[PDB]
Amino acid sequence: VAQGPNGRALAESMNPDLLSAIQQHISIERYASVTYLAMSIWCAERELAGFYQFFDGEAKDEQSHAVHFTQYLIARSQSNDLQTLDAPRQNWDSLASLMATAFQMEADTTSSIQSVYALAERNSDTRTTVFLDPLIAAQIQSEDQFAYLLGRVKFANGDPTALLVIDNELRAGQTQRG
Amino acid sequence: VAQGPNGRALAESMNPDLLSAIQQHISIERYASVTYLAMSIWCAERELAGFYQFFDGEAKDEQSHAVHFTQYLIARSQSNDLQTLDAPRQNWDSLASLMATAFQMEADTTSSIQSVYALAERNSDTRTTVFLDPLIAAQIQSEDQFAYLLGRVKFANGDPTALLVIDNELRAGQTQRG
Amino acid sequence: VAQGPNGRALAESMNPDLLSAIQQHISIERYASVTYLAMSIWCAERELAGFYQFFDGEAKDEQSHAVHFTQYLIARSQSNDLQTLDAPRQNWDSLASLMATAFQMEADTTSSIQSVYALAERNSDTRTTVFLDPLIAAQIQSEDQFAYLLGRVKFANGDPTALLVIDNELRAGQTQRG
Amino acid sequence: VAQGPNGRALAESMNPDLLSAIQQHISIERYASVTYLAMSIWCAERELAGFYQFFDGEAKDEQSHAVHFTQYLIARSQSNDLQTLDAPRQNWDSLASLMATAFQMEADTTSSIQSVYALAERNSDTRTTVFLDPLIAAQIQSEDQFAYLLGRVKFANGDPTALLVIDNELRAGQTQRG
Ligand SMILES: [Cl-]
Ligand SMILES: [Cl-]
Ligand SMILES: [Cl-]
Ligand SMILES: [Cl-]
Ligand SMILES: [Cl-]
Ligand SMILES: [Cl-]
Ligand SMILES: [Cl-]
Ligand SMILES: [Cl-]
Ligand code: NA
Ligand code: NA
Ligand code: NA
Ligand code: NA
Ligand code: NA
Ligand code: NA
Ligand code: NA
Ligand code: NA
Ligand code: NA
């Protein structure tokens, strides 16, 4: 029995390019987390309490997704490498603009997973494509969700009354098409 | 065992300046109470039933805070001196203007406590700073709350529809960022 | 009514030095969080599942403490400024060495709060000293806790059997003197 | 409607190489089962009752996994071919050595599935890759589990006290990082 780079028994070696890609993806999700935290603060600063609560939860959920990846590396007997985290964006001119960045962030998170997925396929790492499959499924749901929130906010067309209505929807947990 | 000015056994004498400051602070909170009553009436007069209910409760709560201070003086064996209460403001041009006065009233209430706090520190009255600590903590929450209500009302920008939505929020007990 | 730097109604201006100190303290706690995450990974890599679970929870709790500070700034109508997060330490020669760093991290977190506290006292910011008081109280408990965990691990003197026993204690939630 | 080789209606023909690979994989899992039975006996012979119980359950679970594959062949209207089963290994010099073989057995089971998976991809048999996906997911968990058990036993470094502690963990059902 061989030992992996993190010292645990090694079921199957991992290509160093694939390892690096996963470690960077973990950074992407950690960065998405602090971005959603930044977005929650922006919403709180404008009394959009429902949006604040929503993004506070998204930040915690994205961090969980990141930790889920660190557990996979542990499971594969690979080393983790927790990286420097950039500061998030913190200023937006409108809620519509914030939601556009949020949607883009979710889509970019999926692109990162897709990048890791294709590397794993090239390396015939079937453990990793299997591991990623449900995360892609969740990303589809999140993209559908954030398209819904962005589109609904854009439909409001900057009217405060409509944005207060949506804010209250979010506070109630009405965050998807359902 | 010595007797305090109110006739009870005296654990520790209180500086007369500090006593006067507390007695005046009690007046401040009694005045905040009748102000919130005035504000509840203004809201009722305009069918803003949620705001009416909110301010009716604030008036009762502020009175309780005032009585809490009278109990402290009793506990310190100091005399109370319930003072003349000025008439409150009773006219505003808009709900936004009313909420501005309400926010200012809460902040001014905190300033009064801060004034008492600094006097107690000068007099090394640790009973009094300890007694005031949780009241300052509550004031932070109230300031955060009234900033939320004021900001949300200002966001409405005088639109009746938005103000009816917020009114209904208040009736439901949705009065903070949460 | 004046507006604070984050745009909300301003109950009382905050000195920019104090603001900066709080913003940096938020970074300290965010850094403590990712450090505990790093520590949880190290423990998982060595099959110390109880220590892994403990530090996984500490990481989430420290993040919550950080967010609690961001809410205070919101409450004070001050701007947040979420900063770059350094990479954590990730390598230790022994569990005893890891626990030493963990203890030091908790103590350094308290020192940071103490630094903010003294600045607030200089500025007579009683809202902030009151806000910090329960956090200092929690830090005392955490320091007592981490002294217990470190001392118990040191008592084991590197014996694997003893460390497995303690590991199982941690998995069960036995993490303090009780 | 055509009939498959086992006589049932045939939804889609299967390449004979892929069929043979699955039939041999069934043998692999049947062999893993009897190996874990052998391992349970070795542990029972040395009064390691927790390890005995663990491996007794693993043997039954591995047999279930094997039968799950036979059901897939039935579902695909393909013939099963239950093969001669070799005798398992039955002697080890230490629990650490036994656990090394167990870990290797789990990893080799995954390699067999990976081999079948790649054959199915070459044959564009999407039913089979889909069928295998959750089994690969389970194998990741089992590899993580057996790395944990092996690493924990190795950490004990042959000390009977530590091995008794771990034995009791296994009897309680504490068999993973959790
Ligand atoms: Cl908008
Ligand atoms: Cl951006
Ligand atoms: Cl208005
Ligand atoms: Cl006025
Ligand atoms: Cl140690
Ligand atoms: Cl260090
Ligand atoms: Cl051994
Ligand atoms: Cl062998
Ligand atoms: Na902001
Ligand atoms: Na980054
Ligand atoms: Na009136
Ligand atoms: Na008065
Ligand atoms: Na490590
Ligand atoms: Na940092
Ligand atoms: Na204090
Ligand atoms: Na035997
Ligand atoms: Na065989």
Residue numbers in the entry:
A (entry chain A), B (entry chain A), C (entry chain A), D (entry chain A): 5 to 182
Which lines from the publication concern this structure?
Ferritins are proteins forming 24meric rhombic dodecahedral cages that play a key role in iron storage and detoxification in all cell types. Their function requires the transport of Fe2+ from the exterior of the protein to buried di-iron catalytic sites, known as ferroxidase centres, where Fe2+ is oxidized to form Fe3+-oxo precursors of the ferritin mineral core. SynFtn, isolated from the cyanobacterium Synechococcus CC9311, is an atypical prokaryotic ferritin that was recently shown to take up Fe2+ via its threefold channels.
Crystal structures of SynFtn have been reported in the iron-free state and following either 2 or 20 min of soaking in a 5 mm Fe2+ solution. These revealed conformational flexibility of the side chain of residue Glu141, which is located close to the inner surface exit of the threefold channel. Variants E141A and E141D both crystallized under conditions identical to those reported for wild-type SynFtn. Protein structures derived from all crystals harvested without iron enrichment were free of bound metal ions, as expected. The structures of variants E141A and E141D overlay with that reported for the wild-type protein with overall rmsd (for main chain atoms) of 0.10 and 0.11 Å, respectively, with the major difference in structure being associated with the side chain of the substituted residue. Typically when site 3 is vacant, residue 141 is oriented toward the FOC. This is the case for the metal-free structure of variant E141D, while conformational flexibility at this position is not possible in E141A. In the case of E141A the second-order rate constant extracted from the gradient of this plot was 1.1×105  m −1 s−1, significantly lower than that measured for wild-type SynFtn. However, the effect is less severe than that caused by disruption of the threefold channel by the D137A substitution that led to loss of all rapid Fe2+ oxidation activity. This suggests that residue Glu141 is not essential for Fe2+ to traverse the protein coat, and that its role is to direct incoming metal toward the catalytic FOCs.
